[PDB]
């Protein structure tokens, strides 16, 4: 009935959204860290290839390793640019919009939870409208609802209740008076009229919206109405804008999965940086024919397919470094070493060795 | 008087906090981008020094440049690791906690704003308690108070209303009945009693807290009480925990200002990576005395003070690259080139040149 407390069919879908929004900051941390980790993996491979080249000057494979190093260094560079220019804003915006909307929802649900007169009469009722609900651990009446922002550890968020289309559980309501409102439970938050609702000496001067514009509480003796949020379109200035903003921000996320962060499997000539480097440093011409590039790649890689790139990478990974550059009895193969700062100083050592060779050769 | 609507002294400090929390995501984006930009500047300096060392192979100047390159590459490496491990978590946590708290505040303030019966009686009153206030633009009675999360663009972090000690404007209130509550304006949100407040047939079962535990609304005919939040300490499980969470997360921010992101002015031997590289690659010993390091640094830098490092960096910055490697009429001196990907492919060109010259000389 109009002007009565809210049964679980009304507020449980809000709890479901609030719980899922709680995971959005966890996904932001996950993606920002994944982007950095992938950049670091690209940098490690660039450094391994660079070290192989310094050690093996004099062979054609050393020049192949210069090409490999350039590829991975360009990937690391472009990944950092993507992290700066694109992912940081995506993940901050998703974190902020989701957390803000969650704050709006949680403040409203916490108000309903506390606005009760007895164990059978209040603003927040169970499914049947028998008992008022109470906070119990991380639930309200058994429904997961923490009404808190949880500590942030990296995790991929679910998209069950907020997905590409909108808020799946926030559908059009055909009979709020019977499906959302109880028959008996008293709740002044259910209307703006003065007899049973928020007005004191008379009705409120206008309808009141709550939960960032989701629920509209009329100033007369009639049931609430709700926004259908399950089929959203991009908009501005809406009365329920925070719902749109969180939906748009979550749907926009790519994760650390654009081309900068992923290795390539389409042959050597088409790999990032390769053709341009062959043209600029080996052919020394401004524009090349595909067959001219293949001829150069044959000299250094013995081919132009993924298998020849993998073979050079195996030579790089198998190459041992000087034992004094690592601990006693520690691994020496480049492929058994990782960490940007660690590999950086190993490259410096071999550059110093190269300097000593040229000092005599010249 | 108890149970009456709230004058501006009550809600204006909440608007001030809300508007400042709105800037936390902007500052997170600013800091994440600043960290990446500083890493990129370190990498550019590493790449310029690396290119100089390839061009000038076999010289003491080149060996100095290998030491410079190693220094800046280690800084770039460590900065990316700090961005991954420390800054990302700091900024996601500050963004989430601030935005969540802002949502809790804004849902409460928006409720007060709408709960009115006339231009003179309502929950949200002006400074004198004469008129209810209205929202126009991003202001409420002239107070900046958008009650929305603004679009996110980078903005340098600042702190005025939420600082190291807490929320400056949220002080102990010794006379809420006269300073917060009006004399006349009616507002059922000001008490839990049934005559003038939220109760219907009787008083609410307990006190109700609002705005994430900031204000306590009694179930009797008595004035609200508020938490003093201007001198916070770390706590867990508090009724006003979201306020503590946002304060702690903001206080924790270091920005892109730790040692990884800042250049050093403490002489050469103590510069990140330098003594270790001299020991490992030049002396080829595990331990060294300071005099042995100074002797090596004299050979390559002509000294061990900042001025000698700066002098090598000036030589590096003045070194031109081949005109074919830049656009028509574009600068060719290394110090006039910037951008990681741009310098990376120049380094690849000169590594190719070095490989070929090594073949010819041997």
């Amino acid at each position: 009935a109009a002007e009565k407390g809210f049964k679980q069919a009304f507020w449980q879908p809000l709890c479901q959204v609030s719980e899922e929004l709680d995971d959005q900051p966890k996904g932001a941390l996950f993606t920002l860290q994944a982007a950095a980790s992938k950049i670091q993996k690209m940098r490690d491979a660039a450094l391994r290839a660079s070290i192989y080249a310094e050690i093996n000057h004099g062979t054609n494979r050393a020049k192949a390793a210069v090409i490999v190093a350039n590829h991975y260094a360009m990937k690391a560079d472009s990944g950092l640019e993507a992290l700066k220019q694109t992912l940081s804003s995506q993940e901050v915006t998703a974190t902020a919009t989701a957390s803000y909307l969650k704050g709006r929802i949680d403040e409203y649900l916490n108000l309903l939870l506390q606005t009760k007169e007895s164990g059978t009469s209040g603003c927040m009722m169970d499914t049947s409208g028998t008992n008022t609900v109470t906070k119990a651990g991380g639930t309200i009446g058994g429904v997961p609802c923490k009404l808190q922002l949880s500590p942030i550890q990296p995790k991929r968020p679910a998209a069950t209740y907020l997905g590409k289309a909108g808020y799946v559980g926030l559908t059009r309501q055909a009979d709020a008076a019977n499906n959302f409102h109880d028959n008996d439970a008293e709740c002044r938050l259910a209307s703006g009229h003065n007899t049973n609702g928020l007005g004191k000496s008379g009705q409120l001067s206008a309808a009141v919206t709550m939960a960032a514009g989701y629920v509209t509480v009329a100033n007369s003796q009639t049931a609430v109405t709700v926004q259908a949020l399950d089929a959203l379109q991009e908009a501005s200035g809406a009365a329920h804008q925070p719902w749109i903003d969180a939906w748009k921000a979550k749907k926009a996320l790519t994760g650390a999965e654009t081309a900068e962060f992923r290795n390539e499997t389409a042959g050597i000539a088409g790999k990032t940086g390769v053709t341009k480097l062959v043209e600029e440093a080996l052919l020394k011409k401004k524009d090349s024919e595909a067959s001219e590039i293949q001829t150069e790649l044959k000299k250094y890689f013995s081919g132009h397919e993924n298998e020849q790139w993998t073979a050079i990478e195996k030579l790089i990974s198998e190459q041992p470094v000087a034992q004094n550059l690592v601990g006693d009895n520690q691994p020496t193969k480049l492929g058994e070493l990782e960490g940007n700062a660690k590999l950086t100083t190993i490259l410096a050592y071999y550059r110093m060795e190269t300097a000593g060779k040229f000092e005599v050769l010249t | 008087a108890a149970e009456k609507g709230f004058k501006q002294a009550f809600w204006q400090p909440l608007c001030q906090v809300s508007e400042e929390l709105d800037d936390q995501p902007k500052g997170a984006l600013f800091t994440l981008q600043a960290a990446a930009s500083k890493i990129q500047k370190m990498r550019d300096a590493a790449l310029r020094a690396s290119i100089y060392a390839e061009i000038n192979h076999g010289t003491n100047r080149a060996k100095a440049a290998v030491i410079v390159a190693n220094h800046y590459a280690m800084k770039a490496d460590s900065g990316l690791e700090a961005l991954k491990q420390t800054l990302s978590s700091q900024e996601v946590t500050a963004t989430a906690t601030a935005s969540y708290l802002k949502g809790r505040i804004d849902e409460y303030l928006n409720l007060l704003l709408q709960t009115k019966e006339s231009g003179t009686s309502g929950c949200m009153m002006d400074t004198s308690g004469t008129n209810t206030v209205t929202k126009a633009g991003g202001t409420i009675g002239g107070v900046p108070c958008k009650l929305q999360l603004s679009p996110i663009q980078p903005k340098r972090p600042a702190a005025t209303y939420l600082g190291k000690a807490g929320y400056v404007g949220l002080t102990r209130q010794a006379d809420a009945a006269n300073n917060f509550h009006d004399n006349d304006a009616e507002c059922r949100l000001a008490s839990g009693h049934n005559t003038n407040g939220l109760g219907k047939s009787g008083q609410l079962s307990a006190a109700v807290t609002m705005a994430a535990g900031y204000v306590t609304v009694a179930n009797s005919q008595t004035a609200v009480t508020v938490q003093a939040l201007d001198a916070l300490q770390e706590a867990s499980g508090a009724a006003h925990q979201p306020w503590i969470d946002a304060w702690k997360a903001k206080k924790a921010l270091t920005g892109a200002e730790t040692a990884e992101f800042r250049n050093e002015t403490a002489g050469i031997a103590g510069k990140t990576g330098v003594t270790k590289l001299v020991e490992e690659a030049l002396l080829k010993k595990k331990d060294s005395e300071a005099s042995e390091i100074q002797t090596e640094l004299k050979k390559y830098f002509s000294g061990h003070e900042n001025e000698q490092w700066t002098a090598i960096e000036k030589l590096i910055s003045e070194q031109p690259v081949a005109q074919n490697l830049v656009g028509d009429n574009q600068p060719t001196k290394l110090g006039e080139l910037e951008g990681n990907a741009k310098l990376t492919t120049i380094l690849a060109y000169y590594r190719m040149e070095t490989a070929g010259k090594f073949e010819v000389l041997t």
Partner: nanobody
Framework: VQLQESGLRLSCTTSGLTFSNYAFSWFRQREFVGAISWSGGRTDYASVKGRFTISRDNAKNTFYLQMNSLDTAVYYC????????????????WGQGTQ
């Protein structure tokens, strides 16, 4: 990520992508039309040289095809990470096309 063609002057505006990291090309149907390098310092044109001009505006995340003396076909934009502006490149992203 999305490349969205629009528009005679055609526009291709990206979303979810670091526009400045990518070279961009126009194709039509499948025939190559023109390409611009990631830095914007190089352009290459197919049948269309002297009638069409390709350009980029990094600040607007938009790549453009200015067509003069005209096709008929669907025109598609494509992105190539750090590419040199070549029709032979591997393109990581493509639009849906415009008539």
């Amino acid at each position: 990520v999305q490349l969205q063609e629009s528009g005679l002057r055609l526009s291709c505006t990206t979303s979810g992508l670091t526009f400045s990291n990518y070279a961009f090309s126009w194709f039509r149907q499948r025939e190559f039309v023109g390409a611009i390098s990631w830095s914007g310092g190089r352009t290459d044109y197919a049948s269309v040289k002297g009638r069409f001009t390709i350009s980029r505006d990094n600040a607007k995340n938009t790549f453009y095809l200015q067509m003069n003396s005209l096709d008929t076909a669907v025109y598609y934009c494509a992105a190539d990470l750090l590419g040199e502006g070549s029709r032979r490149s591997e393109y990581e992203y493509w639009g849906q096309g415009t008539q």
